[PDB]
Design a protein around this ligand. Structure first.
Ligand SMILES: Cn1cnc(Cn2ccc3ccc(CNCc4[nH]c5ccccc5c4[C@H]4NC(=O)c5ccc(O)cc54)cc32)c1
Ligand SMILES: Nc1nc2c(ncn2[C@@H]2O[C@H](COP(=O)(O)OP(=O)(O)O)[C@@H](O)[C@H]2O)c(=O)[nH]1
Ligand SMILES: [Mg+2]
Length: 164
């Protein structure tokens, strides 16, 4: 049948949360003003024979934050591979989400975005080590080339499906 999955994309300003979401929904990467930007996004796909209705919230980097964290079922934790501070922020997002949801098992996927860029300051191994501490998948993405974009969102749905 049909099941909705509320996904929340979190991470520092400028890592590419909006660009990743727009690549998945609108199949484009644009540097200028984009009129397709909206309050939340929707995409229907089939995963494991179930019609999955992805309902995605693209956030900014407290009452509203707590409400979207409690409402959200899965979290895409995004950093940019050429921005060490955005990677350092990840553990703070993870602890904040766990504290707000009062849960030890929160579906999450760690996303290392801007993989198309040559200016890499966070190695793949560093991100894999942080992800293994949480027992969550780590996926390298590029909203520009689409590398790993589909994988990041559907792996998060699969993590929610396993949790449920
Ligand atoms: C705030 N906002 C987001 N989209 C709209 C557009 N919109 C207008 C009516 C209308 C009805 C239905 C939906 C689908 N769900 C939107 C959505 N996707 C999420 C994915 C993950 C976590 C939270 C959401 C939500 C919001 N729902 C909530 O309870 C909530 C609480 C706090 C929020 O900051 C946002 C939401 C859009 C709607 C408004
Ligand atoms: N080269 C490259 N630029 C990206 C990528 N994702 C986002 N950007 C750019 O980085 C800037 C910030 O992106 P944005 O989606 O607004 O980040 P957000 O603040 O996390 O929502 C913009 O100039 C984007 O075009 C990516 O994968 N590769
Ligand atoms: Mg944005």
């Amino acid at each position: 049948g049909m099941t909705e999955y509320k996904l929340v994309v979190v991470g520092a300003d400028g890592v590419g949360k909006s660009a990743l979401t727009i690549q998945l929904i609108q199949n484009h990467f644009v540097d200028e003003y984009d009129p397709t930007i909206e309050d939340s996004y929707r995409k229907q796909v089939v995963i494991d024979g179930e019609t999955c209705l992805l309902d995605i919230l693209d956030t900014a980097g407290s009452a509203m934050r707590d409400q979207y964290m409690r409402t959200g079922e899965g979290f895409l934790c995004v950093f940019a591979i050429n921005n060490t501070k955005s990677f350092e922020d990840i553990h703070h997002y993870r602890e904040q989400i766990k504290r707000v949801k009062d849960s030890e098992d929160v579906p999450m996927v760690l996303v290392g975005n801007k993989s198309d860029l040559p200016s890499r300051t966070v190695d793949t191994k560093q991100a894999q080590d942080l992800a293994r501490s949480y027992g969550i998948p780590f996926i390298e993405t590029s909203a520009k080339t689409r590398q790993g974009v589909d994988d990041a969102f559907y792996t998060l749905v699969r993590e929610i499906r396993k949790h449920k």
